[PDB]
Coordinates of C-alpha atoms and ligand atoms in Angstrom, one line a residue:
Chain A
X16 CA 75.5 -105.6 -2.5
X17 CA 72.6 -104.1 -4.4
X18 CA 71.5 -101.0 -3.6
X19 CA 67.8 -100.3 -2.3
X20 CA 66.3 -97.1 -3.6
X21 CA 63.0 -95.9 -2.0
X22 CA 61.5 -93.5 -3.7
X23 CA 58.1 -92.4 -4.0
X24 CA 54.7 -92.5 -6.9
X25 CA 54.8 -88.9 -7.8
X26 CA 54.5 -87.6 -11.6
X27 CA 56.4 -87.4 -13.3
X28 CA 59.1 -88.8 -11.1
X29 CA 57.7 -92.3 -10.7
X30 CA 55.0 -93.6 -12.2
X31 CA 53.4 -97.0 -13.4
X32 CA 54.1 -98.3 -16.9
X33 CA 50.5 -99.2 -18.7
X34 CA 51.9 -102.7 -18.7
X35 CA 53.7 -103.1 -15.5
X36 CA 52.0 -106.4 -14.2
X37 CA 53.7 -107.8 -17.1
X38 CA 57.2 -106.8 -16.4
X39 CA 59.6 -107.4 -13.3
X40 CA 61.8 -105.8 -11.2
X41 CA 62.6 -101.7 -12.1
X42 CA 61.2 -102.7 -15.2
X43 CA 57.9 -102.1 -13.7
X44 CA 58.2 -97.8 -13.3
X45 CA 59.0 -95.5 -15.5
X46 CA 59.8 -91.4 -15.0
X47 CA 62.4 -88.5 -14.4
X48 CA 63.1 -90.3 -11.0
X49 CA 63.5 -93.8 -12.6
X50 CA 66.0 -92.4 -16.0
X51 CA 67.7 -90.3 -13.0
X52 CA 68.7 -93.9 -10.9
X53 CA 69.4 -95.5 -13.9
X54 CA 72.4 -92.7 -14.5
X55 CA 73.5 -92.5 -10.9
X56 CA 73.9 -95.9 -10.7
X57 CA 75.7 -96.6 -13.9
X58 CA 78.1 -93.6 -12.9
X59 CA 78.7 -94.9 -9.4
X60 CA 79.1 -98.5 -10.5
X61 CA 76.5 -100.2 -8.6
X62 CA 73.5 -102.6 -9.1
X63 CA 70.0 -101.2 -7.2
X64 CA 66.3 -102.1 -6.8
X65 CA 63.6 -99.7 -6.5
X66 CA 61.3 -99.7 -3.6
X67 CA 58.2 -97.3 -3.4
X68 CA 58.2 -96.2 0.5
X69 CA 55.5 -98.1 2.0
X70 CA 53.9 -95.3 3.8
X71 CA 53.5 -93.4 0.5
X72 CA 55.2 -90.1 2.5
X73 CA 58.1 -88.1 2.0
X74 CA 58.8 -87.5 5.7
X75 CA 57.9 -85.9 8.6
X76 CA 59.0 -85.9 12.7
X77 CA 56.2 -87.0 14.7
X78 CA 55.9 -84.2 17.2
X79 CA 55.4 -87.0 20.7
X80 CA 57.4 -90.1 19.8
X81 CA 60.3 -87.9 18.0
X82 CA 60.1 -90.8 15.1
X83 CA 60.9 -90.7 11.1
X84 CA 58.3 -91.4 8.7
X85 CA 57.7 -91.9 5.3
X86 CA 61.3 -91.8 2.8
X87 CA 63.5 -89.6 5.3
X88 CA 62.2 -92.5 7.9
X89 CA 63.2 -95.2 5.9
X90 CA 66.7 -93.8 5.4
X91 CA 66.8 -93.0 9.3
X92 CA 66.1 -96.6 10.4
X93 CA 68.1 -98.4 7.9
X94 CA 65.4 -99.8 5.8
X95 CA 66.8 -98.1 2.1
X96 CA 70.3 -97.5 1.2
X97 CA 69.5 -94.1 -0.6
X98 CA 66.5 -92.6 -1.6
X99 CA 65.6 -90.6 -5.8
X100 CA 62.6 -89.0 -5.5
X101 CA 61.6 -85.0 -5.5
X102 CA 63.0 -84.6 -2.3
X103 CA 63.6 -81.2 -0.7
X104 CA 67.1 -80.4 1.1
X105 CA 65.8 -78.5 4.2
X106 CA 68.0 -78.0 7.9
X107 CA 65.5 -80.2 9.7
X108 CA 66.3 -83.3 7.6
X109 CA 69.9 -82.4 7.4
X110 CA 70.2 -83.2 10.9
X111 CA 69.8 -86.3 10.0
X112 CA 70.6 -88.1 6.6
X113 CA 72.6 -86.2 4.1
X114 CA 71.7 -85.1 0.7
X115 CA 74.0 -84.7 -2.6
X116 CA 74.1 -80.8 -4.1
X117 CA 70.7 -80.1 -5.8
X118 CA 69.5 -82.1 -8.7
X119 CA 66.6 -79.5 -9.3
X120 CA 65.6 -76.4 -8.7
X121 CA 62.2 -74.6 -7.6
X122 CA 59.7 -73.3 -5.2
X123 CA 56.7 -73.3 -3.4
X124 CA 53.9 -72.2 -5.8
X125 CA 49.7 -71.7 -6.1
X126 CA 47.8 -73.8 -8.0
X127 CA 44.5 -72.4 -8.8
X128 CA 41.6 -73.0 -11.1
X129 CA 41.4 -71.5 -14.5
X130 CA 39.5 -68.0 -13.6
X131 CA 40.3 -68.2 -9.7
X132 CA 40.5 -64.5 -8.9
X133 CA 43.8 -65.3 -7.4
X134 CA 47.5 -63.5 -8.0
X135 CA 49.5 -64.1 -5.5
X136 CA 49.9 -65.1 -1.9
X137 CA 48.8 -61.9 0.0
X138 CA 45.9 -62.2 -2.5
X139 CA 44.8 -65.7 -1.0
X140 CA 46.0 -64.2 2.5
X141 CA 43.3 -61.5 2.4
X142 CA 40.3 -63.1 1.9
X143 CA 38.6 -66.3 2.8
X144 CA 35.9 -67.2 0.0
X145 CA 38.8 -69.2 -1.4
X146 CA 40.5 -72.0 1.0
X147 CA 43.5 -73.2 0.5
X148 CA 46.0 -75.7 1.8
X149 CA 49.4 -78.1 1.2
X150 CA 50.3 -81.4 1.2
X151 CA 50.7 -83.4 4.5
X152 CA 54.1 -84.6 5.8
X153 CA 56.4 -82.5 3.7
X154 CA 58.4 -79.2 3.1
X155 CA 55.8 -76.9 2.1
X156 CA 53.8 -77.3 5.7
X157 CA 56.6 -76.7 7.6
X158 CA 57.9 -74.0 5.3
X159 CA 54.3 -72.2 6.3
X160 CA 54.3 -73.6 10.2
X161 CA 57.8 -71.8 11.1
X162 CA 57.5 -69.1 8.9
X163 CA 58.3 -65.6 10.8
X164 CA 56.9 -63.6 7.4
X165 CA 53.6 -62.0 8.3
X166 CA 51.7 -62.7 4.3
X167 CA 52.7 -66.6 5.5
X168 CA 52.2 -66.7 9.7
X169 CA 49.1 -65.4 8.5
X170 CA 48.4 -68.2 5.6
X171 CA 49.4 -70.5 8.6
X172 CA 46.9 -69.1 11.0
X173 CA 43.7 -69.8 8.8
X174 CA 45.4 -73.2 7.3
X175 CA 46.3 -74.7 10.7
X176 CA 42.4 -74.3 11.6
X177 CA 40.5 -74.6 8.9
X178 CA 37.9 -77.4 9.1
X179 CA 37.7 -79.2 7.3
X180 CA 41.2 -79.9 6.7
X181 CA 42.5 -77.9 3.8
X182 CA 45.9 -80.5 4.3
X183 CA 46.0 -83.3 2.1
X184 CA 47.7 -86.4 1.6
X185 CA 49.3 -86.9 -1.6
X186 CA 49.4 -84.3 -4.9
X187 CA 47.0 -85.6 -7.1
X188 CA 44.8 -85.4 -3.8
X189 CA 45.5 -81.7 -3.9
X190 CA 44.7 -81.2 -7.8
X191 CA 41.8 -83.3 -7.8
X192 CA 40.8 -80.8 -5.4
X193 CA 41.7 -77.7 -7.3
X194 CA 39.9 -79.0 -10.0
X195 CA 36.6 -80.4 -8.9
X196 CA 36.1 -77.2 -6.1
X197 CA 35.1 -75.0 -9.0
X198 CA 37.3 -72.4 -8.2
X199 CA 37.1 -72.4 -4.3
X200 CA 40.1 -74.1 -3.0
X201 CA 43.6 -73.4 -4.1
X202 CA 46.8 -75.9 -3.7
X203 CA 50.3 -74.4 -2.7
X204 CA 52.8 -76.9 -4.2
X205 CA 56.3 -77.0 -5.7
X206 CA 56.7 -74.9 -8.4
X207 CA 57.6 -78.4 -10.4
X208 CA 54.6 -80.4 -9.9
X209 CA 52.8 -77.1 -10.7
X210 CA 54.5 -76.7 -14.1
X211 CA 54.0 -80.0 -14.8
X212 CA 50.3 -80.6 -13.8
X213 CA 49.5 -77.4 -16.3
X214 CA 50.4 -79.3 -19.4
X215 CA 48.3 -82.2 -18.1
X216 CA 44.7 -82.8 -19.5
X217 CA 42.2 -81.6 -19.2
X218 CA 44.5 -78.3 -19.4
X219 CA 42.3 -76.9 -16.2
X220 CA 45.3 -75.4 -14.0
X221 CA 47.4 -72.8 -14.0
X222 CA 50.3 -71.8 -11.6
X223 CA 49.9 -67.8 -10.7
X224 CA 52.5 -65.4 -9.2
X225 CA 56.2 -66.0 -8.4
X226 CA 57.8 -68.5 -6.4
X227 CA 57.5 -68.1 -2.7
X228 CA 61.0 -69.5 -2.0
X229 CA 63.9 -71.0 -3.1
X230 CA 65.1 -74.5 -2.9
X231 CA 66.4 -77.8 -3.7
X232 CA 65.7 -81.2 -4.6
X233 CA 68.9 -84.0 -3.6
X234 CA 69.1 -87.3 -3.5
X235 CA 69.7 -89.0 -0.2
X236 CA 71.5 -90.7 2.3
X237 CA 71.9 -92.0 5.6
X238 CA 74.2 -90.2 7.4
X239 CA 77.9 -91.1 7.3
X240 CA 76.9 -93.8 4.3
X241 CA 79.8 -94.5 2.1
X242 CA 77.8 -93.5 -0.8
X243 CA 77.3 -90.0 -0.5
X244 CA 80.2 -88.6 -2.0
X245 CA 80.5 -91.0 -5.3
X246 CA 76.3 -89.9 -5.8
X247 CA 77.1 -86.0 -4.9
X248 CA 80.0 -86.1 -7.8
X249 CA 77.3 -88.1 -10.2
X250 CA 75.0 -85.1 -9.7
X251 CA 77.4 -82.8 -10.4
X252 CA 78.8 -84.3 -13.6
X253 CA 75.1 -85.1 -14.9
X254 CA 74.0 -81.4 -14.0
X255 CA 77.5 -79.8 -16.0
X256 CA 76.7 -82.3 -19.2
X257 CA 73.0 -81.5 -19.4
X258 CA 71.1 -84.7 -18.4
X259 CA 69.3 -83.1 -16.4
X260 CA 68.1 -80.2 -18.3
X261 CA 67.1 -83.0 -20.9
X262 CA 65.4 -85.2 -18.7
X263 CA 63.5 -82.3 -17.5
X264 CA 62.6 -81.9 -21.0
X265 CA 61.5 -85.1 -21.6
X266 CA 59.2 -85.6 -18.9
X267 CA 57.3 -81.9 -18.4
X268 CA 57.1 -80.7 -21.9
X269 CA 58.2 -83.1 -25.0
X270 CA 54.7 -84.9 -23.6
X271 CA 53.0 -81.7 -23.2
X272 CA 49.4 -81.9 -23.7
X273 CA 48.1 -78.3 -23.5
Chain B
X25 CA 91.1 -67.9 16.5
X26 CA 90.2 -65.1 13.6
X27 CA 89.1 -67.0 10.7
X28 CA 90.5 -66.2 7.4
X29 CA 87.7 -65.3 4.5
X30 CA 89.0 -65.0 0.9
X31 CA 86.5 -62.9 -1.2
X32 CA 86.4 -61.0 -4.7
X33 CA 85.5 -57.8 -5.2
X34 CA 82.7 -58.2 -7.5
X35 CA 79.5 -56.3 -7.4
X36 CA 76.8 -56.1 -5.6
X37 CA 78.6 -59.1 -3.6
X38 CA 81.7 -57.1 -2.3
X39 CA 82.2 -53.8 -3.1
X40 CA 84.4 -50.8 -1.2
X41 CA 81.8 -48.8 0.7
X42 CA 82.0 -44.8 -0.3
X43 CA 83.9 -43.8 2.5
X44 CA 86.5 -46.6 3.3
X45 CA 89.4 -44.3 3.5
X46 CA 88.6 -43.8 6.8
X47 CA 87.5 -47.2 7.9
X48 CA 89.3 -50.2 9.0
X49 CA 88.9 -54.0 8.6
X50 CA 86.0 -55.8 7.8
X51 CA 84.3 -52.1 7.7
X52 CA 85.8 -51.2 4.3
X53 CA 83.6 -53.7 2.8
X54 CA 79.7 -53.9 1.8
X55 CA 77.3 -55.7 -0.3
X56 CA 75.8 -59.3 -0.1
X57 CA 78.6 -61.5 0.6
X58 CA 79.5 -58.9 3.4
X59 CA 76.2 -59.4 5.3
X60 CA 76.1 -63.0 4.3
X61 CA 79.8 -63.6 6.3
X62 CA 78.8 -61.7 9.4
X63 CA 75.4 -63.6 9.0
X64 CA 77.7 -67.1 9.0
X65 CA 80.1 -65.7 11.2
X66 CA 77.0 -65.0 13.9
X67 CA 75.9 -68.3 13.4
X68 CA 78.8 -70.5 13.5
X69 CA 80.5 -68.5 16.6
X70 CA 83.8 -67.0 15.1
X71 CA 85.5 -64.0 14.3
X72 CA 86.6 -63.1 11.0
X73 CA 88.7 -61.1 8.2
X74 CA 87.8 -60.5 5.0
X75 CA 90.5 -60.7 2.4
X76 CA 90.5 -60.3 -1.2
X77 CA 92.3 -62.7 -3.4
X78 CA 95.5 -61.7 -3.8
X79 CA 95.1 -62.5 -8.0
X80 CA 91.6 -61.3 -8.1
X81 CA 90.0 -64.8 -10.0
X82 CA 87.9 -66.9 -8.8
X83 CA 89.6 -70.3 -9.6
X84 CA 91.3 -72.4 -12.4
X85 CA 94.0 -75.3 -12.5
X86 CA 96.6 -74.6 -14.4
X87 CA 96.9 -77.5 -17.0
X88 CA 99.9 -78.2 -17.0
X89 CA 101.7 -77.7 -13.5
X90 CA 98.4 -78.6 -12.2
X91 CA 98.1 -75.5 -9.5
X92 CA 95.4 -74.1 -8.7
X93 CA 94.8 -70.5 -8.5
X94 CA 92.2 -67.9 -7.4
X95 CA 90.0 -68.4 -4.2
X96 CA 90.1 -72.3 -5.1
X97 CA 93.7 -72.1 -4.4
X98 CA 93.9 -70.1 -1.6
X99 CA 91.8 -72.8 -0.1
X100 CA 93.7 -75.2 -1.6
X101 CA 97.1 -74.1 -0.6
X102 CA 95.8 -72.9 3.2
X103 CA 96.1 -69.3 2.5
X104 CA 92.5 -68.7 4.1
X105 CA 90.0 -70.8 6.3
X106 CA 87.0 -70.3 4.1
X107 CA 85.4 -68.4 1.1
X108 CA 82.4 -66.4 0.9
X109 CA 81.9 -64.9 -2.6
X110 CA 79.9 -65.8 -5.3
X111 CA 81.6 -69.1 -6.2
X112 CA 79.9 -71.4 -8.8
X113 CA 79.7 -75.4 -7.1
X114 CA 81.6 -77.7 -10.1
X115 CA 82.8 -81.2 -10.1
X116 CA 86.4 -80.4 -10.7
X117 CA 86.1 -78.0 -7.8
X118 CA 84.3 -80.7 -5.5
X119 CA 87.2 -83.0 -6.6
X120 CA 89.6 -80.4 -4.1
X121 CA 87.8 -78.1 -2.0
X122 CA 84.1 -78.4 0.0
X123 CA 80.9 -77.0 -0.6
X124 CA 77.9 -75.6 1.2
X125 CA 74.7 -76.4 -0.5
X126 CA 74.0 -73.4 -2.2
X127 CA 73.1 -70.2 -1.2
X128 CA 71.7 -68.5 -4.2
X129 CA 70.7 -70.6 -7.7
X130 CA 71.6 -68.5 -11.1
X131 CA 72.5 -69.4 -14.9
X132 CA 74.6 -68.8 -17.5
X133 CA 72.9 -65.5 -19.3
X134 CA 73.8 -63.2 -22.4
X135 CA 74.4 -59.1 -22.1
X136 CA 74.0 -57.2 -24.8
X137 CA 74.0 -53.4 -25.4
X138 CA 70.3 -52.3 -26.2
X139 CA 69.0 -52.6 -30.0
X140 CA 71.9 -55.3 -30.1
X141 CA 70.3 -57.7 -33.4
X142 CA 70.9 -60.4 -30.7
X143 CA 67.7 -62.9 -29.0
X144 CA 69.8 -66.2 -27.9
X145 CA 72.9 -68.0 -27.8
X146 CA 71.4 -70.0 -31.1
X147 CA 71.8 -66.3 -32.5
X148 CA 75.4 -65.9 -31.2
X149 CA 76.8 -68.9 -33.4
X150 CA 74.9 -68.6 -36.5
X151 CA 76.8 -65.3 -37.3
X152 CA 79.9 -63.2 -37.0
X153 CA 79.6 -59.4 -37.1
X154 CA 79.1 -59.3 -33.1
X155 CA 81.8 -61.0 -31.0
X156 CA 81.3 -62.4 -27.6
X157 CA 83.3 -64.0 -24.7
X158 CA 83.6 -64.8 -21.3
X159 CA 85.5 -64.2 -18.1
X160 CA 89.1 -65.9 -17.9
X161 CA 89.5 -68.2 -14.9
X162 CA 86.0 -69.4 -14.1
X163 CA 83.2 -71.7 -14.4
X164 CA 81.4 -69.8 -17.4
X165 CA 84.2 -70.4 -19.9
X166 CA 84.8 -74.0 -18.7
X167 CA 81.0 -75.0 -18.9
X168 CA 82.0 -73.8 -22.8
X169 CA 84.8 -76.0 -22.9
X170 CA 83.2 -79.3 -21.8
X171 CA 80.1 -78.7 -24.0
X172 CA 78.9 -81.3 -25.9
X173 CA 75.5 -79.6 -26.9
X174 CA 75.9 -77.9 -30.7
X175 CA 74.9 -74.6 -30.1
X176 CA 77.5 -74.4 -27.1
X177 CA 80.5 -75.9 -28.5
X178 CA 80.0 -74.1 -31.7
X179 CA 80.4 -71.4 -29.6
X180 CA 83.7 -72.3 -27.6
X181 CA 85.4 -73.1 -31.0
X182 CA 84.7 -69.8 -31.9
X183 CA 85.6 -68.0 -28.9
X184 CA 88.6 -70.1 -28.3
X185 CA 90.6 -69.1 -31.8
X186 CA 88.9 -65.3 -31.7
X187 CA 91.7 -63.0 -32.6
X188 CA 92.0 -60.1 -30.6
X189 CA 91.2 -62.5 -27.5
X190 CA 87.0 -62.1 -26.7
X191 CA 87.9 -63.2 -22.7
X192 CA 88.6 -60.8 -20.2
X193 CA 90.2 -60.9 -16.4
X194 CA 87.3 -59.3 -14.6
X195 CA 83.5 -58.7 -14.7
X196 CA 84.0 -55.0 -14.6
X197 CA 85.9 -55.3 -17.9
X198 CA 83.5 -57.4 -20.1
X199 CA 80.4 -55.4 -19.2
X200 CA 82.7 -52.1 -20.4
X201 CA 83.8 -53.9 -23.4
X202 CA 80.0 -54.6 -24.3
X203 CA 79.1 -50.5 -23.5
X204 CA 81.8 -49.4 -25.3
X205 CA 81.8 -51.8 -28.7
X206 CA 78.5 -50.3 -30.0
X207 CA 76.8 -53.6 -30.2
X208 CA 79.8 -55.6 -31.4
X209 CA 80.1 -57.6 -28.2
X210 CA 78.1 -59.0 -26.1
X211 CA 79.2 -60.9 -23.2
X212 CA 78.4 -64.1 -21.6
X213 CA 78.5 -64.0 -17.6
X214 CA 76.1 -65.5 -14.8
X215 CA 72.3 -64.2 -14.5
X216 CA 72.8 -62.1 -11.3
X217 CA 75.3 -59.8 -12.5
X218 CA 73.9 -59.6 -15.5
X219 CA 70.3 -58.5 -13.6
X220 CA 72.1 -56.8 -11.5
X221 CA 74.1 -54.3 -14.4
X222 CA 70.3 -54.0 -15.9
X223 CA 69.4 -52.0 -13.2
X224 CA 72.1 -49.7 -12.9
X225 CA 73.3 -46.7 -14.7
X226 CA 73.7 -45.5 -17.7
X227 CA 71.3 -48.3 -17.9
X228 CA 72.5 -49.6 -21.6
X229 CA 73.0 -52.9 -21.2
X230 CA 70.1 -55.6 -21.3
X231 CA 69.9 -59.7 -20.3
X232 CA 68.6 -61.6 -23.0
X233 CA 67.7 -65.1 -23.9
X234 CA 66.8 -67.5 -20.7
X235 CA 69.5 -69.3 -18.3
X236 CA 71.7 -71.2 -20.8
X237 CA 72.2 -73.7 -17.5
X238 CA 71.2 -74.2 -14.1
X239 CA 73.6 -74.1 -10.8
X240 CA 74.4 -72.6 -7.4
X241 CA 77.1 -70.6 -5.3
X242 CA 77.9 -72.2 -2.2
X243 CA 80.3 -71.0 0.9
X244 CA 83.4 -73.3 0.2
X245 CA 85.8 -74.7 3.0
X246 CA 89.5 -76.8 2.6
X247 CA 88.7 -80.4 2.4
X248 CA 87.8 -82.2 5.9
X249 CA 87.9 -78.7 7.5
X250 CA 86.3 -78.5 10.9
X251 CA 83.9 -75.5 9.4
X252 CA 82.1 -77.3 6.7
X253 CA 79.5 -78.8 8.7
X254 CA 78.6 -75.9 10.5
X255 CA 78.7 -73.9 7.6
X256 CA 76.3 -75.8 5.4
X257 CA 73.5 -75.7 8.4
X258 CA 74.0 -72.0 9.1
X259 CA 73.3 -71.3 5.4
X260 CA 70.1 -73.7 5.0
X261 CA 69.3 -71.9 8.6
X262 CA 69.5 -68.5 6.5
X263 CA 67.5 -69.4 3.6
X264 CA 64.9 -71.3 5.6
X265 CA 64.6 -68.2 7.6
X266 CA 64.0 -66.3 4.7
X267 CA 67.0 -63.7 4.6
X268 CA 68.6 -65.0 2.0
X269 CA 65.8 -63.8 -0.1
X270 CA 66.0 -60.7 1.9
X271 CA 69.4 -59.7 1.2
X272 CA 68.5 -60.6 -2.4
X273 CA 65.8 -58.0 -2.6
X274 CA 68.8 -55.2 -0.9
X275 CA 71.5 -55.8 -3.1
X276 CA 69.6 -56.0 -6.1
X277 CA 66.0 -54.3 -6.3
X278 CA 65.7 -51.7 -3.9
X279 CA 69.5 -50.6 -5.4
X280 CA 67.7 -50.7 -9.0
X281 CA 68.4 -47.3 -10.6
X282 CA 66.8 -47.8 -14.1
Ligands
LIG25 N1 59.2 -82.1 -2.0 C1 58.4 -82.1 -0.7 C2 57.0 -82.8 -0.9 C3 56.0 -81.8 -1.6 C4 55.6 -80.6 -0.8 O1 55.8 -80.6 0.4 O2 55.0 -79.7 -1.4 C5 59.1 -82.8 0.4 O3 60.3 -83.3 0.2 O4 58.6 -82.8 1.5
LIG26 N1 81.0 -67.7 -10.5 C1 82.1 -68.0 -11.4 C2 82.7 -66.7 -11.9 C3 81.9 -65.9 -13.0 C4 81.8 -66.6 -14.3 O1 82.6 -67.6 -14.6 O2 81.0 -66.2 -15.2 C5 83.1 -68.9 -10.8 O3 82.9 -69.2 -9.6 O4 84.0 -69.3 -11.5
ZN27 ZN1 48.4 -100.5 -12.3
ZN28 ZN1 75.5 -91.3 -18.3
ZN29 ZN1 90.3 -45.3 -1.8
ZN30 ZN1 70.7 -64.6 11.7

């Protein structure tokens, strides 16, 4: 009867309210993801609960047992009915849980350090003062681990085997990173968290170059569920009116701090 | 067996090659949209034809016998198998045909003749000495239609009452009436044509303002047709693989001529 919704901690998509231990329920979060839930569900007519995926991943395949982790995981083994968070549509996971048309646009990006003599990929591909790495368990590895482009097979190469490991396990483990390296370790993330991050305090990042690729964020599914098409057709309707564009807004920019 | 593919001849998508007087079939054809169909046709295991729509349009319903016409309806009516143009992904188009997630992202955008006293849509509807409108029988003048944002539907009262009609039946013809009106009309199309006419000769035309929206093409297929699923993979397949981008970067940059 009521939905459950994992999603994940990620700014701005879901964060803690500065009072949450006094509220109850979805009460407790607050963010793009959370307004975004709020709107799907109203459209689709259902009641839901917000879970935050207990592994704190957005998913990966282990390569031995062939199993599901983190949100893609909990959608796989039936432990959430549908999952709102910055999740990218890729063929992998498309094999199996579906995913509504995109709710946002973007793609994989470099974080560097204010000053970082750093302008684009091949720049960080050429030399090796600078390390470099991506988040753990998400698109953006594998995006680099099958790529057949030679500026990125070689990023692979040095990230794959560089000790220590330049791979880390959440975001704000990455831009803590960037920012306490003193130039000497860049982070390739979505183009999103990028943009965001850079109007975040103390005003110490910048995102440099273009995007590497282009993708999607969806919301998603287990496969076959019965909810799929009413959420793809909420998407839709919320893209063509311009919640999402203001939501967008309201979360990356009205709060701008730089 | 030979699967029909309606298309539009619409550059750099589908366009006759020089020669095609003396070529047959599928080999009269070039341009993005051509590679991307033997790309999906390759992928998903089936021969094809490309056709172009008998009405040239890419899809409205008439309001009120309620047919629908232009690649939509050829679907629709199961006068071809599949499409493969640059098709924008709607809600009322969801409602009666299927989508691929999408294979290229783009926005509303404004062309104007260069030295044209315009900077944004804003610009547009606070004045009245330059005209503008949009292709008849698409998703550009309906995302007017449905707006609810000021700016916007300031505009669609406008262009809806304009007198001699602002909309025209093709690309081709709005992007002639902005060359040939001396600045007195600019014209609002999607952000890939219009960076795609930038580049080309005589080189008089300019994009400006950002994407007035944000939204996808995707391959569309009849509802519940056995295609769709494969479809959908073979185009995340493409764009994982990276030639998508690639195909991008031929029809577009290294065709520039400005
Ligand atoms: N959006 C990504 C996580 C972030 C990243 O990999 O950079 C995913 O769904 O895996
Ligand atoms: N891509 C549009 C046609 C061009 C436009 O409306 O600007 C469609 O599928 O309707
Ligand atoms: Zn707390
Ligand atoms: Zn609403
Ligand atoms: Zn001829
Ligand atoms: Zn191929």
């Amino acid at each position: 009867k009521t939905v459950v919704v994992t999603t994940i901690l990620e700014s701005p998509y879901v964060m803690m309210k500065k009072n949450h231990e006094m509220l109850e329920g979805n009460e407790r979060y607050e963010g793009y993801c959370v307004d975004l839930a709020a709107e799907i569900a109203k459209h689709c007519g259902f009641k839901y609960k917000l879970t935050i995926v207990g592994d704190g991943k957005y998913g990966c395949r282990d390569a031995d047992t062939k199993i599901w982790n983190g949100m893609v995981g909990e959608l796989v083994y039936g432990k959430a009915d549908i999952a709102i968070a910055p999740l990218t549509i890729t063929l992998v996971r498309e094999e199996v849980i579906d995913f509504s048309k995109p709710f946002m646009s973007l793609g994989i990006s470099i974080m560097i350090k204010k000053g970082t003599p750093i302008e684009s990929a091949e720049d960080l591909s050429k030399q090796t003062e600078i390390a470099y790495g991506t988040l753990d368990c998400g698109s953006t590895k594998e995006f680099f681990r099958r790529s057949k482009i030679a500026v990125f097979d070689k990023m692979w190469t040095y990230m794959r085997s560089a000790e220590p490991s330049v791979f880390v396990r959440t975001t704000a483990e990455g831009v803590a990173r960037v920012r306490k390296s003193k130039g000497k370790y860049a982070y390739l993330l979505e183009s999103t968290m990028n943009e965001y991050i850079e109007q975040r305090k103390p005003c110490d990042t910048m995102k440099v170059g273009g995007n590497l690729d282009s993708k999607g964020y969806g919301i998603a599914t287990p496969k076959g569920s019965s909810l799929g098409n009413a959420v793809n057709l909420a998407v839709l309707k919320l893209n063509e009116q311009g919640l999402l564009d203001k939501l967008k807004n309201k979360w990356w920019y009205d709060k701008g701090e730089c």
